[PDB]
Each structure stands twice: as structure tokens, then as C-alpha cells.
Amino acid sequence: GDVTVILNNLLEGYDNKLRPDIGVKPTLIHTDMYVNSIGPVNAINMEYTIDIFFAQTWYDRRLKFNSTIKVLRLNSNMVGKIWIPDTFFRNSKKADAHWITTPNRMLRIWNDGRVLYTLRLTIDAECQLQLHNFPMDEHSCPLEFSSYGYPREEIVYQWKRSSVEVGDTRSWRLYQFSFVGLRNTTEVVKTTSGDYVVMSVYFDLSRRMGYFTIQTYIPCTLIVVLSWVSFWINKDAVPARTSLGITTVLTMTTLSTIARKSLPKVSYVTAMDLFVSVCFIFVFSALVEYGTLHYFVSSQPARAAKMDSYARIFFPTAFCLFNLVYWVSYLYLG
Amino acid sequence: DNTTVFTRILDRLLDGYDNRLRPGLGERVTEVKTDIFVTSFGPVSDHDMEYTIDVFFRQSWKDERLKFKGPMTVLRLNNLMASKIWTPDTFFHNGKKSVAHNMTMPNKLLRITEDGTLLYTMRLTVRAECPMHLEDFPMDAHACPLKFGSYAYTRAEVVYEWTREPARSVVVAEDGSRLNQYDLLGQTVDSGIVQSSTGEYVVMTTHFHLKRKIGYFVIQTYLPCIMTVILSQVSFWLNRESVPARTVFGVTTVLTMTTLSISARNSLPKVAYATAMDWFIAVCYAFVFSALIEFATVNYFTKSQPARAAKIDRLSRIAFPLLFGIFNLVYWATYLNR
Amino acid sequence: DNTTVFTRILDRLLDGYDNRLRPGLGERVTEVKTDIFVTSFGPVSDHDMEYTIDVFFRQSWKDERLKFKGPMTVLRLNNLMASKIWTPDTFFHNGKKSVAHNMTMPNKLLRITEDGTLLYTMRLTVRAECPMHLEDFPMDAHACPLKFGSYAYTRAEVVYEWTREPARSVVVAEDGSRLNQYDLLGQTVDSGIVQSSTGEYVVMTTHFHLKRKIGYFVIQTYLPCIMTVILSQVSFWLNRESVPARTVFGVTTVLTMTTLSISARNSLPKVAYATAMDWFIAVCYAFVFSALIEFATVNYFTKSQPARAAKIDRLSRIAFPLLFGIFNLVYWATYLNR
Amino acid sequence: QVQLQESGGGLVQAGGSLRVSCAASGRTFTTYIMAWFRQAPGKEREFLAAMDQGRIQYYGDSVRGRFTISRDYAKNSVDLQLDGLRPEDTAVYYCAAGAGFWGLRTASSYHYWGQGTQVTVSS
Amino acid sequence: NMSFVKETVDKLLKGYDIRLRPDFGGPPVCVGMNIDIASIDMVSEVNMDYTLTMYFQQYWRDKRLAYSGIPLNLTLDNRVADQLWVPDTYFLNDKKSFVHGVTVKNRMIRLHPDGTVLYGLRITTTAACMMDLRRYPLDEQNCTLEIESYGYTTDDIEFYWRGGDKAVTGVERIELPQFSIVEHRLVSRNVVFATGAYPRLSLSFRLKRNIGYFILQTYMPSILITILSWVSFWINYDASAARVALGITTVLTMTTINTHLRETLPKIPYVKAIDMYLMGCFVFVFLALLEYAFVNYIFFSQPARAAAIDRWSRIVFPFTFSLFNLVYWLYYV
Amino acid sequence: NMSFVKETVDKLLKGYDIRLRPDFGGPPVCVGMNIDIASIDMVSEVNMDYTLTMYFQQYWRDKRLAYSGIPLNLTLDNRVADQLWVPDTYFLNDKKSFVHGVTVKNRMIRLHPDGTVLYGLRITTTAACMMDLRRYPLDEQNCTLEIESYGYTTDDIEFYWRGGDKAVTGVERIELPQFSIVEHRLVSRNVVFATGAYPRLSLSFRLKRNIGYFILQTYMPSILITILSWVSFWINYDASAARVALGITTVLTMTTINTHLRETLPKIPYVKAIDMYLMGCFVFVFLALLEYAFVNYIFFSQPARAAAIDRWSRIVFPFTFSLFNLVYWLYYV
Ligand SMILES: *[C@@H]1O[C@H](CO)[C@@H](O[C@@H]2O[C@H](CO)[C@@H](O[C@@H]3O[C@H](CO[C@H]4O[C@H](CO[C@H]5O[C@H](CO)[C@@H](O)[C@H](O)[C@@H]5O[C@H]5O[C@H](CO)[C@@H](O)[C@H](O)[C@@H]5O)[C@@H](O)[C@H](O[C@H]5O[C@H](CO)[C@@H](O)[C@H](O)[C@@H]5O)[C@@H]4O)[C@@H](O)[C@H](O[C@H]4O[C@H](CO)[C@@H](O)[C@H](O)[C@@H]4O[C@@H]4O[C@H](CO)[C@@H](O)[C@H](O)[C@@H]4O[C@@H]4O[C@H](CO)[C@@H](O)[C@H](O)[C@@H]4O)[C@@H]3O)[C@H](O)[C@H]2NC(C)=O)[C@H](O)[C@H]1NC(C)=O
Ligand SMILES: CCCCCCCC/C=C/CCCCCCCC(=O)O[C@H](COC(=O)CCCCCCCCCCCCCCC)COP(=O)(O)OC[C@@H](O)CO
Ligand SMILES: *[C@@H]1O[C@H](CO)[C@@H](O[C@@H]2O[C@H](CO)[C@@H](O)[C@H](O)[C@H]2NC(C)=O)[C@H](O)[C@H]1NC(C)=O
Ligand SMILES: *[C@@H]1O[C@H](CO)[C@@H](O[C@@H]2O[C@H](CO)[C@@H](O)[C@H](O)[C@H]2NC(C)=O)[C@H](O)[C@H]1NC(C)=O
């Protein structure tokens, strides 16, 4: 009975097309964020999905009332009758609010005019990934938002002390990557229409090597190790060395294509491709060296015997030297 | 004649009625009686860790402003009426993009009993999330939940209680089972309290227990791998002279094992941990790789001791099958019991 | 007062104007003149037996309730004014899911002349069904239709017509052809009548005639099969003592054809009958399979009647290439004259 | 072997109904267009009517409003109801089925053709 | 003239209460349905559903919409349907349905002088039917469509097919690429839920699959590969490497077909007809490779006895596979 | 203070006819446009389209919105755009576009004292461009975006780029994994249809593909298969089975690779630059195996000729293949 009278007076003579203190001072907005989950990070399209509760707070002199009550816990039916800031996410590919079974929105108005407005969103934010170090890469996928039509002289955003809260990090839908931490900054962006205050949140991520290593490195490590057996087999056993030589080289032609099947069509060589190509040169050269070795048995059979002994020395050493260079330059050097 | 009798009553209820205020505002706590009727348990997607469900989501509360006395005890009004009176803002905590069907009309129900009690139902297609531990794939079991509760009202304003006993407040349709490779053992119904920065809220839970069926993977994944390993061991029944014959066995089976390994992983998201299927594939790939090693030993040890080379190959004809036969009994007994 | 003059006119027309009644209700037949501008003839989805098309769908009728005497003669008004007046409820009989673009605003045009004649165009994307007889695939042709008419008004109330001579009442933009594998040869414009459970309706029909370009199937399907057939017939010229060599030739090539036979099913839509491509594949399968059979017969007679074995081997160097040459000429002349 | 066999027809006197039918065989013509062609004695072959899978009825510019075409999709046949026959309607009536390529009113677009039926109208 | 028609229609909607069904508080309102199926397409086995396009007609009498003095059937603008009471008919087993909206919302309202209302829609729906694929592809299906009232029980609304068995028309003009419609049926009954008893109408088709497609795709590719293994038995074993190194390739090729045949159909925990045949053909080509290894193992020890086995392999293998096709096709047809 | 602003704004909207353009029945209204491209992605050759996101902005002067006494550029709420007149701009070659709606409809209205209006939107459109793949994967595409008024002719509305060639910004901040934007151009002209002449603003890019990916996934595997078939030249005629096995493996593999790659692009009916390499590399392996048949045939009669031909093939074949790459890589690149 009495609460209806309060609401009617608040909306009497109230114009929702004008922000509070339109010609006086900028409207200061305090924003929070609660992160239910960070969805899969789609590397092919360079995007990720995030599901958050977005909260905003601002004052409004036009919403002051005197009563024994202190806070009016209204619902979404009042959102369309008052001024709401036009916050949008700058790097959002596709976002949408949730409406089942009703508009997932909140509205609470205190007697001093303070307004709280919370809504639930799912955002396909755009994240640019530098896949040079795949699978040992790291990333910092951001999430930026700002006002659309209100410059820095009319709407100013500001984080609160409890900046961003997360739930159970291990329960999120991140399979390949592992969450590290978040950093929230503030910046001012200048465009053709004006200067806008921009708020940013960065989600640091790191891929896991616990699956790629066994999948590709070990099978590509056994082939190089196995391909050396021909150097311990005398060249008289031509069918023995011919079968072994044609096997590993053809085998490496299989995993060569499948390595990039976990990547988009990037035109720069990643860490995985460099390891595969080097793991193909060793096996290819051993077959080729055998051909060079066998081509001079007719000319200098005594000299040809020298090259076989060197093969068991330099070739195993080169692989060990290369692996030390490869792993240190990425795991601890990048 | 008598048609306008009900028209006046409805306009009587909606005159001076505010839908922005919950029933019994500031005097008590609004209680919502909730129950579900699952018409069809939809498909479960492993890639997105989500499942579909269609429900006759019914809610029942009490509003004193909608009392009436007339010739009819219960009014069964049109779905349009539901947008002019207060309704609970129930939402699903773990719900992805859901649908409220609109064919050929808004699939809603609204009945107003004479004492003010309301019944408000709708037909939904809820697409909720589910956490899956794919370590025991494909012999895994899951408990996919369905949590729903209020969004804007704290537990000091709105509380949810099941309409009947929790074991009977959720009903699965007898023919409502669209699952293909899963088994619905049962459901568990529980109610709890969740607390966020804006206050305490009531949350109603519903766990569904699902057990995967291994009929598909036995015929499509395990058996192709098992026989490929067997075909590799046929390389031990060939004369050493016909080297190219044994050459084809090594390359082909290893190439086949790579193809099966890749295609099998296409049916699951790239989880970091190794599924139970991966261990069998990895061991099978180990054997087909171990068989090709044995051929190199035959040629290498022929010049040293031809009899021992014959001894090595003959024992290989027995050693390899024994290891594989024992390994499978280790694998299958490890997972089925647990 | 440069605009208030026109505001009085517009408010005068809509005053007492009921848009639920077609012009000349109960007195005559409302006549609609139609013409289309195909901005782009989109791709043809063969596996769905459909196609896409973007048009400037233009309509024009006469309403005497909208006469005026203003400073101008034609009022080029906002698209909003369309919803204030009666417009024909034209729909497409064989459309599947069309789109009326409204970016950045409803892509509609409304113009009113001083005698009440209205012009009302819009921009549409139409996905229409096109039944296809793929018996002559990939050398098939089609006549994909596009039928539109009123949905609620029978032919005693609303009749459609073409704005100009029917051939010139549907125009195709020069650069709009988005087709990849087909080739639009031209269209025919016709009018018809339909009868349903509700009455008789006028239907305006447009047929687009397409011919498939077989260039893609020459390189991916026909050429590999011809090379495989020629590859198999190499086995004849090998000397009889290369028993392992020719056996590899015979077995592997037939396996290649089975690979090609299955690989043709991907681009091929699922149909019950056998396309013209499958006959070429089937015959090319018999030729390579007969080559393997011929070798076994020659190998069988060796060591028993070698003169006869060599006698047959000479003939297979002639019959197999010549018969395959004769088969190609009939096949490639039968289907190109249709 | 696809055969389009036609029945009905005969002799009528300066009007009156005369229904002509055409029963197909050997193929399902649900997806085809079934049409009727009239070949006057010595003049030429002329188009009369057609009906595609969508029951869209086309008529010639002359016989419109006089003849009625109807298909029985279950029994795979197309009829043609002749009413108010004039003496100049005497000709041989043909039954055709095709895909309507390069126009459905063209005699060259119909692969399958009937054997013809004789209709004679006397004053 | 035309102003008088406007007055008559305007008077009917003055005081009309859309929140109340016709004959509220009295006898139930009878509603008759007519369906004119336009096309059926995309009968998907993987998703276990099908797409249906139709002209949905509804017939009912509202005494509040009766006029006099106008001997016509007023076909009003389709936007007038937002100011009238219409049944809340929904499809229970539908997954995603929509009403076409080009160039306008395809919808019809047609009043009659006695108050009768004809209300038509053009609806495209993707209804779900569960398929029993045990005999795939030599199987029949029974895909249905459930029509029901949501908020009104049998005390308020009653459904009936308008025209009996002639209510649904246009089935015989449907050409499914893979299926062939054998029979359709109409059912009217009641369903009892926790909130009352609701009327229900049902429409069901009994599709039967066409085998001609799978002959060119599954059986013939599998049969020919089996015949290839038999050719190895007429070849002398002097090609010691060849026969074993090509029998393995035939077995490898057989699995390739199986890999691209599990992509065609969903994941189900049983063995279909197509799986039994592929498994059966796999065994025969598996025995052949095992057979030669036995011969090649003793190709030198007892060549006279080894050559004797190939004589019987030329007869036993072709005869046994003819037996397998005898049992298989008799059991599944 | 604020009540004065509300009084002024409400005075403008009173008696504002949204159905009439500014200066109706007078000189045409000029509209200036700026585009601030945010991202380009998914340049699909299969669908022949690209996806664009931009901050579309428009400019025009409405004398009915002028106000005095408030020296501020009023930034009204975005809902007021439904009460004002905005141009009916549309993109002709667009296929599927939308305006983002989080957390509200992404739209800006700003009013200036002289009546100037600034209208802004954030649009994610999927425009259409037809790609000529005759030089794929070494092509250079040209995808545009046609901007045109729909209902207003050149007697009603006039378009012009605002700020000249600076009207489009953000082009330099676009990274594409496959392409690399080389140049962009702005065009203004008039288009004539049957209903009149309409203004048009055209924005076009020029994308050049990056060959870095194709070398490691399309060409390098193809060269190795061709290289391997040369190994059989060094293996003498004695190992007839091995030479045939090596030859038949590559030829099947060349066929195996060729079909797999083509299923990632639309069925364009011509020979792309990638196809000429694979078709060219198929001849060398085919000639490699066909050469052996000539060697084996005359091996029995003339052993001396057979040895020489094998030796001469060891150099002639690699020499000619290098010539093929020399001609191929210069004609296209
Ligand atoms: C080109 O054309 C296309 C169309 O072909 C066009 O798209 C459509 O654009 C219109 C606007 O022009 C959109 O309409 C608005 O939709 C708003 C909500 O959008 C969400 O929901 C859409 C569906 O809504 C139904 O379902 C939801 C639940 O899912 C429910 O909450 C709704 O109430 C509504 O329920 C109806 O339908 C259901 C069944 O679905 C029934 O069960 C139910 O009974 C009822 O009949 C959904 O479609 C949207 O998704 C689309 O858009 C998103 C992006 O936003 C996109 O990502 C998706 O892919 C998809 O495209 C989305 O989820 C709705 O809030 C709007 O209504 C507002 O505003 C209008 C205008 O001011 C006002 O008149 C209304 O009264 C209402 O005011 C608010 O509403 C608040 C929320 O309820 C409420 O709290 C406020 O109080 C106030 O309500 C009243 O206010 C008055 C005055 O103060 C007060 O007196 C009252 O008491 C009361 O408080 C509006 O309807 C439409 O959704 C678009 N559709 C699509 C498919 O995009 C496009 O815009 C065109 N482009 C151009 C350039 O022109
Ligand atoms: C791994 C693969 C390796 C392959 C290696 C190949 C090596 C040799 C090189 C071959 C180069 C081939 C390049 C592609 C050619 C495409 C030709 C093409 O499209 O022709 C079409 C029309 O074709 C024809 O008339 C001819 C059709 C094909 C004929 C093939 C004949 C083959 C004869 C084989 C005889 C074998 C004898 C063996 C004896 C012992 C052009 O007209 P559009 O516009 O397309 O038609 C659309 C209509 O609508 C227009 O009206
Ligand atoms: C997120 O923003 C908040 C608010 O600005 C940051 O909290 C401030 O941190 C600085 C030091 O970096 C302190 O000097 C301020 O007193 C803090 N303000 C508070 C607590 O209200 C917070 O550090 C940011 N998160 C980051 C940078 O990760
Ligand atoms: C309005 O519709 C009704 C119903 O279709 C029409 O009544 C039909 O009239 C024909 C011709 O006399 C009869 O053959 C049918 O049996 C009637 N049907 C019914 C259900 O009565 C009526 O004629 C229509 N009115 C107009 C003016 O066309």
C-alpha cells in the first residue's frame, strides 16, 4: 500500500533520457564482477567464453525517499523506467543476457539514492593468441568494457576494493589451459567521438604439456632412436637396412601433418613444427648417408668403413645437443 | 449474459494491483512450491560437457490480492494474464542458452484458485552444464546436476519448497528417455542455501546419475585395435629371406595404429589427463612398435649366432602373445569392478 | 510551416482508415502488380535440393482511400508508414526459411502518388526448394522454381499480375551470379492457379534453368579412374616370371578403385538410383578387376601349356585398351547429347 | 519400360463433357510435371495444361476456363475434363511427363510422350 | 459501404475479452484440426528427428464473433489475430518449430456470419521420433506428431479431426530420397497429467527404408573385397612375399570402410544388420590371410601337401560365403 | 537546472513527425559517414564471405532539433533513436548482420545546438565477395562493402565520406592468419535502379594470401613423395617386387593426397595453382613406375640397355623436376 506510493512519486516527473547530474559533474560508477566460469578457449577462432555476474553502482538524486524502509529490493520490471548506463564490452565477438525464466536482472534502491544493478552475461570475448611457443605458450586474454555514448566528462568507471571474485577455479571448463591469475587496470581511450574511460581485466593462461608431450614427442623420439639401428647393421644385409631405412622415414611422414591439426592456419613455424622437422632430418639423413655410404663401396670400400663408425658418434650426439637447445630455449627462455 | 460476470471479477483483481511488489511484502516470506515433470531427457554432449532436458516446470505460490468469490471455484485464464501479475524470477544457476517454446502460443499455464493460490507452469528446454571426469573413459559415471533458484530475492523474502516429497517431486516420463549410450540410474533431489556478495539465496538441486554404455566402443575402437595387434604378430610366421613381406607388416600396422589413435581422440575434448582408452591405445601402439623392433634383432643377430637368431624369432612367436593376453586381463579387471 | 502542410495531409489520410480491410472490399478484386530484381543468384545446395536468392521484391496496387492534393505528387515516406496501411500478405509457396533484412533499418520502400497508387518494395533472401533428378549426374540440368502468392485472400479477392511483359518483369543483375558449379542459362516467367482446402489462389511462378559444370568432376573423379585403368593394363607387358610384381599390380589397383568408389559418395547426395557417374566407376571397376583375372589365367596355364599362355597375353595388350577406348566414346557421347 | 497409356475420348455433339485420362506405368511421376498437348489435324502441336508436384495448374491462353486438369498422385495418373467443346477442338490429345527444362509450355521439354487419343466434335 | 463493414468489425472487438475462452464457465469448446503437409525432409538418424512443413488449420465457434447483414466470409488482416482468443495448441514432441514470416507472418483469420472462425498457420517443425536401428538399413520406422492443448483440460476444450480420415492431405505427394511412406494414421485420445486430463490428437507415418542406396555403398564394396582374397588361392605361392603382403592390405582396406561407416550413423550400444555383415565379411578375409600364412609356413616343408590345400580353398571359401548370404538375407527379410 | 534540460528536450519531441525526412519537399539532406573497423575474421572461401565488426557512424543536420541556451552537446539515451528520424542505410552485399545488445543496444544519439545529429552503431556484418581461386594459394582477393540508401533517391539524400580519405580508421590494426591487408580504397558514386538513382558509398580492401602455411602442408609432403620414387632407380631390376611396391605406394599416395586436399574448398570448376603442382607431381611418379615397365620388358632381351636406362634415370628425372619448379614458381609468384 505505502510502498506503491513511494514508487509512484519516484517515477513522477522522472525522465530516463538524462543521466544524473547531466550538466553538473560526471556520473561515477562502481563496477564489480563475479566469474562463474571461463569457458573453452577456442584457438582456431581466437576467442574464449566467460560467464559472469556484472554489477554496477551509481547515485541518483532523483531517487531519494523518506520512509521506515531503507532498501527497495525491486525486480527487472523497474529497469526500463530509470536511467541505466550503456556499458558494452569492447572486445566482445558475441554476448547475450539470460532470460529463463525471467530477465536475469536485479535492482535495489536505497533511501539516499544509491542504485545497484546486477545482470548475468555470457560473453565470447576476442583473444589474440601468439602461438609461436605452442604447446609451451602462455597468454593473457583480456576483457575490456566501457561506455558507448558517454565520454570521460560524463561517465567515469571505477573498480571497487573487491575487484573481481572467482568461484572454484579447478571446476571451470578450461581443459587445455590452466588459470594463473587476474589483473585489473584502467585506461582512457581516445576515439573520433571523444575520450572514453576503459576498464580492463586480464586472465593469465598457460597451456598444459601433460598431453602433447606423450602424444607427439615420445613417438617422434622413438623413431630417431630406432633409426640408428641401421648403423649397427653391416651394409651386406642390404634388405635389412633397406627395410629399416624406408620404414622410419615413411613413418615420420604420418605425424608431420597431424601436428598442425591442433592449430589454426598459422603461417609461422611453431615449436611443435620445428621439433618435427628436425626429427625428420635425422632419419632422412641416416637413410641418405647409407646411400652415400653404399655408393662408394665400389670405389673406396676401405674409406666407406670409416663413415659408418662416425655415424654412431656424431648422429646420437647431435640429437642430444639439439634437444638441450630446444627444451631450454622454450621452457626457461621462450 | 453470464460472460461479463467473470470480466468484472478479473478487472476487479487488476484494479490497483502492483506487479512490482512480491506478495506479502514486508510482512512474511513468500513460499514457492516447485515440482518438475521431465518429458524427455535430452542428449548428453561430451565435447561441451552439457546436456538437454525438457520439463513441465510447475510453480505454485499464494497471493492474497487475487482472492475472489464467484460461481466458478477455479479460473483458468489465458497466458496473457501471466504478464500482469507478480511471478517468481526463478533462474537456473548452471544453465546455458535455454529456450521457452512459443508454438503455436506461449507454452504457459496460469490458474487462480478461489483462495488466491496460483499455479504457473511452462514448457522449457533447459541446456545445463555438467562436470565430467573423463579419466575412466569410456567406463565412466556422472552426476549431472540442475540447480535453480531466485535471482533478485534473498532467502528472507522468497524460499522454495518442493510440492511433494523430494523423491516424488521430480517425475521422469516413462517413454521420456532420449539417451543413446547412457543409462539413467536415478535422480537425487535436495535443497540448500547459497551465499553471494548480495546476500543469501535459496537453491534447489537435482542430480541425475548417468552410466556410460560400452557397447559402442567395444566394436568400434577396442576390437579394431586388438586385431591390428594380432595382424602385426603374424610377422613371426614368415621366412627371414622374404624381407619385403615383413617390411610391409611393420609400416602398415603402425600406420593403422596411428589412424585409430587419432580418430578415437576426435570423439572427446582435448583433456590434459589421459583417458583409460588412451592407455589401451598406447599399450597397443607399444606392442606394434615392439614387434617391428624384433625384426631388426633378427637380422642383427643372424650373423652373430644364426641358431640364436632362430631361437630369438621362435620365442618371439610365443613371448608376444603371452604378454598381450595377460595385459588385457589386467586392463579389463582394473576398470569394470571400479 | 514547411512540413506541417504534409503533416496535416498524412493525419488526414489515416483518420478513419481501417487497415484490416483490403481496398475495394466487397466491391471489386484488389489487383497487385509484381516484379522482381535478382541482385544475386546465390549458391545451390545440392545435398539439400535447394538454392538461395536475393531479390528486390516489388509490389504495386491501388487504394482510393489514400488520395490527396498536396504540393508534391509522390510522397516518399518512412518504412514505418507501411505498418499503418493495408499491404498484401504475399508469401513464397516453396520457400524454406527466408530473411527480410532490416539492417540498419527495415529495408522497405513506400511511395504514395496523388491518385492512391502505392509502390511497396522490400529486400529479401529466399531459400526455395528445388527437386532434382540426379540420374544424369554430373551432367544433369535443373529447372528450379520460385512460386509466390497470397496466403489468406482467394482469387475472388486478390489477383496478382506482372508489371511488364512477363519475360521482362524479372531481371537478373549482371554481376550477381554467386554460382560456383552451376551456370544460369536463363529464366521463364509464368502464372498459374492452385486449389487448396480453403479456396483457389493465384500463383506467380518463375523457373530458373541451371546446367552443372562438370569441370570439377573431371579432375577429381574421372581422371583418377582413367589413370587407374591405364595403370592396371601395364601389368600385361611385364614378363611372366615377375609373379610378385604383377600380383601387386592386380590387387592394389582394385583396392584403389574401391577407395575411389567410396570417395565419390561424399560429394554425391544420397539417392536411391544410380547416377551416370556410378556407371563409369562400375565399368572402370570391371576393367581393372578383369585385368587381375586375366593374369591368373595366364599364370595358371604357365608350366602346363606355355604357348597358349603367351598367346593370350598378346591379345590382352589389344582388347583391354581398345574396348576401354570404345566404352569411353559411347559413354561420353550418350550423356553430352541430353 | 515407361508407357503413358491414354483412355477416354471419342465423339460428342457440339458440347457436353468428355473426360480423358492418362495412366502412367514403370516410373513414379510424383516429382515430374504431367501435361496435356493437343495436335490439330495438319496445323501443329499445341499446349493445353500442366500440373507440377505442387498442384500448380497452368493453362493455355485459349482453353483457359474451359478445361480442368487434375492429378491423382496415388494412382500416378493425370486427367483432363473437357467442357463446352467447340467443333474446332477436334484433334489428337497427348499425354506428357517431364522436368520442364527451358519452359514447361514447350513440347521439347517433355521426355515421355503418350500415344495419343482421338476426340471428334460434330455440329 | 466499406465504412459499414468497418463499423461491424469494430463493434465485435468492443468489449471482447481475450483472457476468456468461448463459452467460459460452460460446455467445452470443440476445436477441429486440418493439416496439409507441404514437405517432409531431413529424416536424420543421428539426431533422431525429422522436419515437417504444413498448413495447420483450426476450426472453432465463438458466439461473440457473430455478425448480421453482411453475406460474406470476412477475411481480415492477419494482425487481427492478436485481438482474439485462439487455442493454445502446442506440439509435445517438437524440438524447434517456427512460423514463417516472409513477406509477412504467414497466418489467416477468416470469420463467418454464425461466429465460426478459421485460423490457419504455415508451420515448419523439427519433431523428434526415436528410431529402432537393430535392423538398419532393412528397417521400418514410426515417426509421430503429438498435438495437445497446454492450459485447457477436457472440461474446457475438446479436439477432433475435421473430416475424419480426410483431415490430413498431401502425404502421397512426398518423395523422400531414402525412405518411402507406407501408411499414415490418425488417433484421438486423452492424456492424464498431474494437473488434469488433456485432449490429444496424433499423426503418425510408418516410413520404410530403401535398400538400393546401401547396395552401392556398403554391400558391393564389401563383397568385392571378399572376392579379391579368393584370387590369392589361384596364384602360385612362389611369390612368397606377395600373397601375405597383399592379404594384409585387403584386411586393412576392409577396416577403412568400417571407419567411414560409423560416421554415417549415431552411437548406439548394439549391433545392427550392417555391422553383422561387415563383421561376417571381415572374418572371411581374415581367415584367408590366416590360411596363406599356414601355407607359406610349410610352403617348403610339404609343398605337395601345401598345394593340395589351395585346391580346396578354391571351393570351400566361395561356397561358404554363399551360405553366409543365404542365412543373412533370409533372416533379415 | 536539470528541469530546464528536460523542458527543452520535451519541447523538441513535441510535434516531431518521424514520418518525414529533414527538409521534406526541399533540398536533399547530406549524410556523412565514418567507419572505425574493429576486427575482420573468418574470410571463408567455402562460403565466399568475410565477417566484419565496425563502429558505424552517421552525420546529418535536422533544423527541427535546434535549441538555444544550453551550451552542451546533449547525449540522450539510446532509446530516443526510436523517436527521431535516422537514415535508412543498408549494406547491399551483406548476408547476415546484427547490432550488439549487451548490456544494452549498442547505439549512440548526440544532439548539437545547431541541430546536428550524430548516430552511431556497432555492427557485426557478414558481407559477401566472390573469390577467384585460379591462382590459389597465391591469389590476391578484393572484398568490398557496398553502402547505399534504400528508400531515398539522390533527390532526397546525398552521401559523402566525412573527413575525406581519413573516414575509415583501424585498418592498420587488423591481423589475419591467412591474409594481409595491402590497400583499402573509398569510392562514392550513384547507382540507378528501375525506381530511381540512389547514392552509394563503396569501401574495398585488397587481401593478399600468405603462402607460409601451404609450403609446410601442401607442397613439402608432395615433393618428398616425388623424391622417394627416385629411390627405385638405384635399386636394380633384381628386386622387382620392391621396385613395384615402392612405385605403387607413391602413385596411390599421390592419388590419396590429391583427393583429400580438395574437399576443403568449394567445387570450383577449374585448375587452381595448387592443383597444377599435384597434377604435375603425379606425372613424375607415374613416369617413374611406367619407366620401370619399359625397363623390365626389354630386360630379358637386352640386359645391357636396362642397366644404362636405370643409371640415366638417376639424373634426368631430378634435372627435369627442378626445371618444373623453376617454371612453376616463376609463372605464379
Ligand atoms: C529486425 O527485426 C527483428 C525481428 O524480426 C528485431 O529483433 C527483435 O527486436 C525487438 C525490438 O524491436 C525485440 O523485442 C524486445 O525484446 C526484449 C527482450 O529480448 C530478449 O527476449 C526476446 C524474447 O522475449 C520473450 O521471451 C523472453 C524470455 O526468453 C521474455 O523475457 C520476454 O518477456 C518475451 O516473452 C514473450 O515470449 C515468450 C516466448 O519467447 C512468452 O513465453 C511470453 O509469454 C512472451 O509472449 C528474445 O527474442 C531476445 O533474443 C534476441 O535478441 C538478442 C539480443 O537482445 C539476441 O542475442 C538473440 O539472438 C535474439 O535475436 C532476447 O533474449 C524485450 O525486453 C523488449 O521489451 C521491452 O522493451 C519494449 C520497448 O521499449 C517495451 O515495449 C516492453 O514493454 C519491454 O519494456 C521493458 O521490458 C523489461 C523486460 O521484461 C521490463 O523489466 C520493463 O519493466 C519493461 O516492461 C514493461 O515496461 C512498461 C513501460 O515501462 C511498463 O509499463 C510495464 O509494466 C513493463 O514493466 C522487446 O520485446 C525482439 O526480442 C527481437 N527479436 C529477435 C529475435 O532479435 C530486430 O531488432 C530488428 N532490427 C532493427 C535494426 O530494427
Ligand atoms: C590424380 C589425378 C592426376 C591427373 C593427371 C592428368 C594428366 C593429364 C592432364 C589433364 C588435364 C585436365 C585438366 C582439366 C580438364 C577439364 C575439361 C573440362 O572441364 O571440359 C569441359 C567440357 O568437357 C568435355 O566436353 C569433355 C569431358 C571429359 C572428356 C574426357 C575424355 C577422356 C578420354 C579417355 C580415353 C582413354 C583411352 C585409353 C586407351 C589406352 C569444359 O566445359 P565446361 O564449361 O566445364 O562444361 C559446363 C557446360 O555447362 C558448358 O556448356
Ligand atoms: C583492481 O583495481 C583495484 C582498485 O583500483 C586495485 O586496488 C588498489 O590497488 C592499489 C595498488 O595497486 C592500492 O594502492 C589501492 O589502495 C587499491 N584500492 C582499493 C583496494 O580500493 C587492485 O589492486 C586492482 N587489481 C590488480 C591491479 O590486480
Ligand atoms: C463461407 O464459407 C462457408 C464454408 O466454407 C461456405 O459454405 C459452403 O458453401 C458451399 C457452396 O454453397 C457449399 O458447397 C459448402 O458445403 C458450404 N460449407 C459449409 C461448411 O457450409 C460459404 O459459401 C462461404 N461464403 C461465401 C460468400 O463464399
Side-chain angles (χ1 to χ4, degrees), chain A residues 158-164 182-186 199-200:
Chain A
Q158 181 181 7
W159 292 111
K160 296 189 67 177
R161 312 188 182 185
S162 176
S163 318
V164 173
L182 37 81
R183 305 169 292 100
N184 52 265
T185 68
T186 307
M199 319 292 281
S200 303

Side-chain angles (χ1 to χ4, degrees), chain D residues 12-34:
Chain D
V12 296
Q13 178 186 167
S17 66
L18 186 48
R19 189 173 189 87
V20 188
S21 181
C22 165
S25 58
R27 184 187 289 268
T28 296
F29 291 101
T30 297
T31 51
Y32 287 74
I33 301 181
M34 307 200 72

Side-chain angles (χ1 to χ4, degrees), chain C residues 183 185 211-216 218-219 223-224 226-227 230 233 320-322 324-325 328 332 336, chain F residues 254-255 258 262 269 271 278-279 282-283:
Chain C
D183 184 16
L185 299 169
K211 191 176 188 63
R212 185 187 297 262
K213 288 185 284 178
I214 75 176
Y216 168 75
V218 172
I219 179 186
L223 270 186
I226 296 178
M227 302 307 300
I230 293 182
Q233 300 181 14
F320 277 56
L322 248 56
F324 193 69
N328 277 283
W332 290 103
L336 293 191
Chain F
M254 294 295 298
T255 295
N258 178 74
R262 197 166 304 165
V271 203
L278 295 178
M279 288 176 53
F282 173 83
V283 183

Side-chain angles (χ1 to χ4, degrees), chain C residues 48 67 113 222 255 257:
Chain C
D48 303 335
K67 296 189 305 302
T113 69
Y222 284 97
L255 265 46
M257 291 300 301

Side-chain angles (χ1 to χ4, degrees), chain A residues 125-176:
Chain A
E126 185 180 31
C127 181
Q128 284 292 149
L129 304 175
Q130 311 298 142
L131 298 177
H132 291 76
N133 301 25
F134 163 86
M136 292 163 289
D137 60 336
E138 296 182 355
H139 304 300
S140 75
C141 287
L143 180 62
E144 321 174 13
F145 65 92
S146 65
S147 177
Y148 196 96
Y150 295 92
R152 59 174 293 182
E153 300 96 5
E154 305 183 28
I155 282 190
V156 189
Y157 288 87
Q158 181 181 7
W159 292 111
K160 296 189 67 177
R161 312 188 182 185
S162 176
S163 318
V164 173
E165 305 297 333
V166 295
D168 289 1
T169 308
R170 57 188 175 183
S171 302
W172 295 350
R173 284 194 54 196
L174 290 178
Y175 333 104
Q176 300 163 315

Side-chain angles (χ1 to χ4, degrees), chain C residues 6-7 11 76 101 103-104 107-109 111 121-123 180-181 213 219-220 237 239 256 266-267, chain F residues 17 19 24 89-90 92 94-95 97 150-151 153 156 195 198 252 262-263 267 269 279 293 296-297:
Chain C
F6 301 105
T7 298
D11 283 357
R76 296 177 293 274
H101 307 272
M103 180 70 49
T104 73
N107 300 157
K108 297 179 179 179
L109 160 64
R111 295 175 185 172
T121 103
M122 60 175 59
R123 194 170 80 90
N180 287 329
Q181 47 186 347
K213 288 185 284 178
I219 179 186
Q220 194 192 211
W237 297 77
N239 70 90
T256 305
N266 305 329
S267 57
Chain F
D17 202 324
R19 301 170 303 189
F24 185 80
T89 306
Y90 79 101
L92 181 73
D94 136 74
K95 296 163 59 181
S97 34
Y150 193 84
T153 74
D156 269 313
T195 54
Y198 303 91
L252 176 66
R262 197 166 304 165
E263 297 186 2
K267 305 170 183 173
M279 288 176 53
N296 193 283
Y297 175 81

